[PDB]
Amino acid sequence: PLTSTVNGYRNVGYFAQWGVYGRAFQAKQLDVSGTAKNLTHINYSFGNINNQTLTCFMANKAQGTGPNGSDGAGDAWADFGMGYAADKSVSGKADTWDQPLAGSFNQLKQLKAKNPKLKVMISLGGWTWSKNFSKAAATEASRQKLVSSCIDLYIKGNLPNFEGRGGAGAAAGIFDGIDIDWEWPGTNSGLAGNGVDTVNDRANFKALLAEFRKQLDAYGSTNNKKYVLSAFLPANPADIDAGGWDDPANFKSLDFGSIQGYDLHGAWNPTLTGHQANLYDDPADPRAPSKKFSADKAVKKYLAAGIDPKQLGLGLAAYGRGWTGAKNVSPWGPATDGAPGTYETANEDYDKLKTLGTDHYDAATGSAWRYDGTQWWSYDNIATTKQKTDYIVSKGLGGGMWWELSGDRNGELVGAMSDKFRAAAPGPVTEAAPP
């Protein structure tokens, strides 16, 4: 039977909702580049949770700033309203007036039509939209309401009327599951202002995941389909404990989860360069123990809990974090500020960093970086991707994950990983592909 794997391994890629604008990264590029053929799951980022109704919703309101910036924020236009010309679509045909579905939702639908093993998941939350998870998961009633609303909107595909698009079942069949990205339950390590209950978030979150599992299976039984549930797993052991992310019980609800293997350090500390995605602990890191992370440290914590490794995956970065005024080529050195970025400050795509200054790779820590005498960038390259994939295989994990697809448009890193998967012994994942 066809499985959503590459020789038994998952290769998950995040697709940014906002990437279709300035970055001009659309689903078509995944097709023509051959990258989609190397992916097993695409996480559409993101779906927001309404601050007033505590439910999944569809709106057209810009994300603002301040404590209320995410209230009611959404981009229905990018999601399903935006019309694609024949020379910009995956199918090669333009969106017609009669289509109830357009936007990236329809583009991904066209991509799935060319990749039978490919699944599309809706990622809820994210760093910017995690403010309302705590309240939404507070009671049995609130949890039931949230889950029901998300399945109705994304799984059943019932969209509201917007710009001549939308309607009941408009997005039917596109989403194969839900990915939960609450950053982070039971702790205030996430964005300041997020709802947080250090006492009950852990238990409420466990209950929330169980409700998602229950409702997804209930719906799947009515149409003979098997939906999956995943989540973005934290790397910080403190976050892991706070949310009960390493509680085996949660993996009776989640089919799998992809572990954060990036953003372990960054320009938010403008005077100290360092690794944002090191595979192993770095003896040279001079910071306090509570701030030192590594992908390996996180992976081992989940494995120590008895969580089935096939239900885990490791995330890699298709971008780098950089500093300017970096005095040394060696990591953990002085710098003056975050470096300029093409689209976002102190952040740059792998596609641009692969030719910036000179490349550096440290197999001992499983890290890579660019240095041009002034700017220092921490990122993942072919070398770290190959080493980390060997690690995924050697640890018996279920696969890899990428944040985010627009940074590696030719699928050089995604491909290096998939190539490794196809050459390795059969993976442990048997997850069925979409019908």
Helix (H, G, I), strand (E, B) or coil at 82: coil
Backbone angles phi, psi at 162, to 5 degrees: -155, 125
The tokens of 340 are what? 């300029």
Q: Considering only CA atoms, which of 360, 356, 342 is closest in space to residue 406?
A: 342
Phi/psi of residue 177, nearest 5 degrees: 175, 180
The structure tokens listed for 228 are 């999956």
The CA distances from residue 121 to 34, 47, 96, 271, 294, in Å, are: 20, 11, 25, 38, 27
- Output the CA torsion sign for 403, 405, 411, 417: positive
Check whether residue 230 and residue 356 sit in a common domain: no
| Domain CATH for 371 | 3.10.50.10
Q: Judge if 5 and 123 occupy the same domain.
A: yes
Alpha helical stretches, state H, 44-113: 76, 103-112
Residues 248, 350, single domain; the answer is no
Query: What's the angle, vertex CA 224, arms to CA 120 and CA 80, rounded to 5?
Result: 30
Q: How many domains does the chain have?
A: 2
Structure tokens at 11: 């290769």
Structure tokens, 15: 């697709």
- 186, 238 Cβ separation under 8 angstroms: no
Beta-strand runs (E) in 152-227: 159-162, 165-167, 177-181
- 11 with 149, same domain: the answer is yes
Q: Is the peptide bond before 140 cis (omega within 30 degrees of 0)?
A: no
Contacts of 21 (CB under 8 A, 6+ apart): 78
Residues 297 and 353 in one domain: no
* 3-class SS of residue 176: coil
Catalytic residue among 163, 183, 348, 412: 183
Residue labelled with tokens 């947080």: 196
> What CA–CA distance (Å, rounded) separates 257 from 260?
10
- Assign 267 to helix, strand or coil: coil
Same domain? 125 vs 252 = yes
Same domain, 146 and 295: yes
- CA-to-CA separations, 115 to 112, 196, 266, 423, 434, in angstroms, rounded: 5, 40, 36, 21, 10
Within 183-237, strands assigned E span: 228-233
Q: What is the CATH number of the domain that holds 180?
A: 3.20.20.80
> Which of 339, 358, 380 is the last residue before a domain boundary?
380
Same domain (yes/no): 305, 332: no
Most distant CA atoms of the chain, gap in Å: 62
Q: Are 65 and 56 in contact (CB under 8 A)?
A: no
Tally of CA atoms within 13 A in the half-sphere of 189 that contains its CB: 20
183 has catalytic annotation = yes
Type of residue found at 327: K
DSSP 406: G
How many Cα neighbours within 13 Å face the side chain of 54?
17
The closest of 146, 272, 283 to 214, measured between CA atoms, is 146
Residue with tokens 């236009």: 77
The length of the chain in residues reads 435
One domain for residues 411 and 373: no
Resolution in A: 1.7
Q: Are residues 62 and 157 in the same domain?
A: yes
What whole-number distance in Å separates Cα of residue 278 and Cα of residue 365? 6
Q: How far is CA 296 from CA 33, 72, 365, 374, in A?
A: 31, 37, 10, 30
- At residue 425, φ and ψ (nearest 5 deg) are -65, 155
Q: Residue 319, SS3?
A: strand
Give CA torsion, residues 64, 204, 14, 90, to 10 deg: -90
10: Cβ contacts below 8 Å, ≥ 6 apart: 4, 40, 41, 256, 313, 398, 399, 400, 401, 427, 429, 431
Q: How was this structure determined?
A: X-ray
Q: Are residues 256 and 157 in the same domain?
A: yes
Strand-pairing partners, residue 228, are 177
Measured from the Cβ of residue 239, the count of other Cβ atoms closer than 10 Å reads 20
Question: Which residue segment(s) compose the domain that 215 sits in?
Answer: 1-317+381-435
Per-residue tokens: 138: 């507070």
* Local structure of 32: helix, strand or coil: helix
Partners of 42 in beta bridges:
13, 120
At residue 219, the 3 state secondary structure works out as helix
Residues 294 and 327 occupy one common structural domain: no
Dihedral Cα 148, 150, 153, 157, nearest 10 deg: -90
Helix and strand totals (H; E) in the chain: 11, 18
